[PDB]
mmCIF file of N, CA and C in Angstrom:
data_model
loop_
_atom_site.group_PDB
_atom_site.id
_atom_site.type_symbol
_atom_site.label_atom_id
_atom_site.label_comp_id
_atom_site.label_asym_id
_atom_site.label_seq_id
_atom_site.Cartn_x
_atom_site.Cartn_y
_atom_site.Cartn_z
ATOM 1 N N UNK A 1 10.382 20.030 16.080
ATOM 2 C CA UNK A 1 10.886 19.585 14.748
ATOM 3 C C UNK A 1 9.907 20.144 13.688
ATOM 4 N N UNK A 2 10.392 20.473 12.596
ATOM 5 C CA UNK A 2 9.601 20.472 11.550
ATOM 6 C C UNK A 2 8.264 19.838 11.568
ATOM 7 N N UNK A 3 7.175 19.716 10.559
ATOM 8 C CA UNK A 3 6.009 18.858 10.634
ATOM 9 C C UNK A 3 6.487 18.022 9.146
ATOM 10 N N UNK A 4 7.228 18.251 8.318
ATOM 11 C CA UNK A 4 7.777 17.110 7.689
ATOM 12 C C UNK A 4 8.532 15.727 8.320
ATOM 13 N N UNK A 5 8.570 16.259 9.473
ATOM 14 C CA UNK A 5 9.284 15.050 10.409
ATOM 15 C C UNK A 5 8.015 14.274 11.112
ATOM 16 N N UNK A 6 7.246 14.209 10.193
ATOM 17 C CA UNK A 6 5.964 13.737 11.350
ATOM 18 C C UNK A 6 5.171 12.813 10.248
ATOM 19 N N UNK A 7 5.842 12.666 9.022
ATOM 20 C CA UNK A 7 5.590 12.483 7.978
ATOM 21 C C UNK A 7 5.674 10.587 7.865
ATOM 22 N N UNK A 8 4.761 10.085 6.942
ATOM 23 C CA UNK A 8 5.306 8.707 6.986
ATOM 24 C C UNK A 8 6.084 8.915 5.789
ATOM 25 N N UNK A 9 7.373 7.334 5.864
ATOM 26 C CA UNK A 9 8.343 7.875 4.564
ATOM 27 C C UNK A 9 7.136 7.715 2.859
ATOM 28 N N UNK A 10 7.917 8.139 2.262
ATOM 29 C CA UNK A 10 7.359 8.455 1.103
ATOM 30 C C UNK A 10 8.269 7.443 -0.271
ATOM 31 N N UNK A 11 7.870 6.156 -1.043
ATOM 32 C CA UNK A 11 8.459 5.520 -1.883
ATOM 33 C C UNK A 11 8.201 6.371 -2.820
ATOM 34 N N UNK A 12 7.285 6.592 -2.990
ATOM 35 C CA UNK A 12 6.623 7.327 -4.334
ATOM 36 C C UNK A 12 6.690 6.377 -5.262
ATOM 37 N N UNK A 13 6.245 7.396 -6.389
ATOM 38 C CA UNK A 13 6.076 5.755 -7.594
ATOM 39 C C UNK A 13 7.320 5.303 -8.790
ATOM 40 N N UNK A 14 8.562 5.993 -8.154
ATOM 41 C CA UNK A 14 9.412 5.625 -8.995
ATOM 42 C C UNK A 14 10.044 4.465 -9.207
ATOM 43 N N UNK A 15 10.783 3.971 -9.760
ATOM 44 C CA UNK A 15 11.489 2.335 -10.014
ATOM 45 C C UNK A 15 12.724 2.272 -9.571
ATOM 46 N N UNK A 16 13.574 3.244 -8.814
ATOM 47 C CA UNK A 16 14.515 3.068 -8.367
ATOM 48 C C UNK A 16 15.116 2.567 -7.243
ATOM 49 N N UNK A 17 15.934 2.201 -6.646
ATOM 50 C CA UNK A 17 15.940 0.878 -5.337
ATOM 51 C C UNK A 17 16.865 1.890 -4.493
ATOM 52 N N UNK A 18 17.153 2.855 -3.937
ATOM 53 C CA UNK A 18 17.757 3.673 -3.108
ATOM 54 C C UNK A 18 17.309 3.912 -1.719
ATOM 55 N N UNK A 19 18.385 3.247 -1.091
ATOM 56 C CA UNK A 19 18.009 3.671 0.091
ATOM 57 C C UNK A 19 18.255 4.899 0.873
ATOM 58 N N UNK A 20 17.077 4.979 1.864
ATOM 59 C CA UNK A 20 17.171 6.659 2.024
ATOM 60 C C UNK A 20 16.968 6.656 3.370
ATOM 61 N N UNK A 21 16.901 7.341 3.938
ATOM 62 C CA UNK A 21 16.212 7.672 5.921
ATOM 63 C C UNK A 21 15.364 8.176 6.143
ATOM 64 N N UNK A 22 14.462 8.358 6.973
ATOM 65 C CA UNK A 22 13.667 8.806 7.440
ATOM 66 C C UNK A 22 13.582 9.136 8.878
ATOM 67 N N UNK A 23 12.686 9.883 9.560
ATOM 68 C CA UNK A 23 12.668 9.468 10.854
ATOM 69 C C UNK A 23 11.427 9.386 11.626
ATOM 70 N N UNK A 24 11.200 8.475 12.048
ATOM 71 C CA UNK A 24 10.117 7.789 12.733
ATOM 72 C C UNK A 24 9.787 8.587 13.962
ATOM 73 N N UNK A 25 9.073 9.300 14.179
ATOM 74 C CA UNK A 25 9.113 10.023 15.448
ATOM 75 C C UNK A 25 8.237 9.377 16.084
ATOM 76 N N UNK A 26 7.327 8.066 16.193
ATOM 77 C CA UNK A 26 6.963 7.391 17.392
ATOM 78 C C UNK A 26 7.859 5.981 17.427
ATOM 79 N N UNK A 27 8.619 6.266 17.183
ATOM 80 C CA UNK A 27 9.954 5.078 17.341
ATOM 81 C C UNK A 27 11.015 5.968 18.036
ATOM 82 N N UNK A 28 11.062 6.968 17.716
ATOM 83 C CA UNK A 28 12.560 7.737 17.735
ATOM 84 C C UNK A 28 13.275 7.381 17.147
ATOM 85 N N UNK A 29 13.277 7.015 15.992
ATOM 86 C CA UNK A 29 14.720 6.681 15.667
ATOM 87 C C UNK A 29 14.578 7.086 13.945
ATOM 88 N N UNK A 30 15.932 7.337 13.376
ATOM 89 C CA UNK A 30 16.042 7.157 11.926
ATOM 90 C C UNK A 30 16.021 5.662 11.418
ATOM 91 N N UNK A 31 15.071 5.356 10.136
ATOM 92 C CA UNK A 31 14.757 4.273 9.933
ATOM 93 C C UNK A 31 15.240 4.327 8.423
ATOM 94 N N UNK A 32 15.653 3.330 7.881
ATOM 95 C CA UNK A 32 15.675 3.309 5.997
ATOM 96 C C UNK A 32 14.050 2.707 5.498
ATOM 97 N N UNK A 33 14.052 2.950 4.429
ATOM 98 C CA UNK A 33 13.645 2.951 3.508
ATOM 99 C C UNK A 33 14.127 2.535 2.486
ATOM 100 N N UNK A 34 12.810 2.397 1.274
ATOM 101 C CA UNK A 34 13.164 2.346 -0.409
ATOM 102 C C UNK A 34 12.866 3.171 -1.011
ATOM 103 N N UNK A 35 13.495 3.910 -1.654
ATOM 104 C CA UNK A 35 13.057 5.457 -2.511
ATOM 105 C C UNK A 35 13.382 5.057 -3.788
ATOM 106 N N UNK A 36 12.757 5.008 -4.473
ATOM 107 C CA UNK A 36 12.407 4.927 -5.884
ATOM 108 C C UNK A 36 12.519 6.045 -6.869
ATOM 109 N N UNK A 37 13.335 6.904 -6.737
ATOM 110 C CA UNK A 37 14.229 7.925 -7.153
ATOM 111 C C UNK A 37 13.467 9.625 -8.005
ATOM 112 N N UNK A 38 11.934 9.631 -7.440
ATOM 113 C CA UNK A 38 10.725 10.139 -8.415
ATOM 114 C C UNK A 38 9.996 10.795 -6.872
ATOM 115 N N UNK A 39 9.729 12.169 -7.295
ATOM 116 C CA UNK A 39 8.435 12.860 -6.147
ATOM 117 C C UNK A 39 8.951 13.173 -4.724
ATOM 118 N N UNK A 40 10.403 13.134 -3.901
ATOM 119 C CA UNK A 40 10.548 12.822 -2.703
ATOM 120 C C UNK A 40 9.874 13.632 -1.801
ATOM 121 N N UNK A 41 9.552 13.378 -0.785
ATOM 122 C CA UNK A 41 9.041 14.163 0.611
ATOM 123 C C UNK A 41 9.853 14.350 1.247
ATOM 124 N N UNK A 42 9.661 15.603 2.258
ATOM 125 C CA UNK A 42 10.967 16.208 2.498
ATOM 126 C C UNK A 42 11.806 15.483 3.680
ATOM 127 N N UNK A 43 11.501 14.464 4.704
ATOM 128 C CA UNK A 43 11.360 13.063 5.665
ATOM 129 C C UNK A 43 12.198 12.222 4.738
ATOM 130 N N UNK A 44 13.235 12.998 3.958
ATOM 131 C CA UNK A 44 14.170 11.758 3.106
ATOM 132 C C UNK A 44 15.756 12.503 2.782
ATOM 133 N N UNK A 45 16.577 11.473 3.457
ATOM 134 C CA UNK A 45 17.982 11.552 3.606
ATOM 135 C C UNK A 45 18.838 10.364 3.591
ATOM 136 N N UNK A 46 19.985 11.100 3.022
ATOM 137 C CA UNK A 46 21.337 10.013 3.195
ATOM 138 C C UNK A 46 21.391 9.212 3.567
ATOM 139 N N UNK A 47 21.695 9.310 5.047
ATOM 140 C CA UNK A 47 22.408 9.062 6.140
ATOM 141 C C UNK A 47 21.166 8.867 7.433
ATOM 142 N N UNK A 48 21.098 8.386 8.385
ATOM 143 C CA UNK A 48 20.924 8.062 9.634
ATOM 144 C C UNK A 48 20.693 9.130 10.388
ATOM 145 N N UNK A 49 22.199 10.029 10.486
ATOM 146 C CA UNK A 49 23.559 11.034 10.958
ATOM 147 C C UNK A 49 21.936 12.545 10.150
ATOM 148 N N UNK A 50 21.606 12.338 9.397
ATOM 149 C CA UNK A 50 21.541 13.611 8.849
ATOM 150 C C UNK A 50 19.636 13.697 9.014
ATOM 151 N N UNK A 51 18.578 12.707 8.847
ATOM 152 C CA UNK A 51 17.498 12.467 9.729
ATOM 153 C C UNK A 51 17.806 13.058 10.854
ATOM 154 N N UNK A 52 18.548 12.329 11.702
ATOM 155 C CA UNK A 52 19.062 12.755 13.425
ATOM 156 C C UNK A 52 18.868 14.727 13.676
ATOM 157 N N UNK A 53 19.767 15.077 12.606
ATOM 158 C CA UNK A 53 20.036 16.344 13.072
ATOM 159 C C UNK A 53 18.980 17.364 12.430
ATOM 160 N N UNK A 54 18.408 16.799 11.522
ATOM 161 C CA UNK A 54 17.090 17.458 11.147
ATOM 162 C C UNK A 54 15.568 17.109 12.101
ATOM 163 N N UNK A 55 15.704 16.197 12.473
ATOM 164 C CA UNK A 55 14.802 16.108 13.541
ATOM 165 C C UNK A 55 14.687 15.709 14.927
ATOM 166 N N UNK A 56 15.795 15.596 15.173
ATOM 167 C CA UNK A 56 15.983 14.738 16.665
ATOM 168 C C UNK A 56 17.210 15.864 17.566
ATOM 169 N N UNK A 57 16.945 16.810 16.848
ATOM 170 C CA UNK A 57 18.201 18.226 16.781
ATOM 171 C C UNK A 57 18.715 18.524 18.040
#
């Protein structure tokens, strides 16, 4: 996988309440988050479905 997939998720410092995915690679699994809509890291998606296929490929 990428080394952005190795990433912890990233809120950053924005004020926005969006939830986003990530993926946990000592869990395995896509996890949500709160993304605050400001700075994202690249360990941030939609969907579940779209984490999965970017890192769990």
């Amino acid at each position: 996988r990428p080394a952005f997939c190795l990433e912890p998720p990233y809120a950053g410092p924005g004020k926005a309440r969006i939830i986003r995915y990530f993926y946990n690679a000592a869990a395995g699994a896509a996890q949500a988050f709160v993304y605050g809509g400001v700075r994202a890291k690249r360990n941030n998606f939609a969907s579940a479905a779209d984490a999965l296929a970017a890192c769990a490929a």
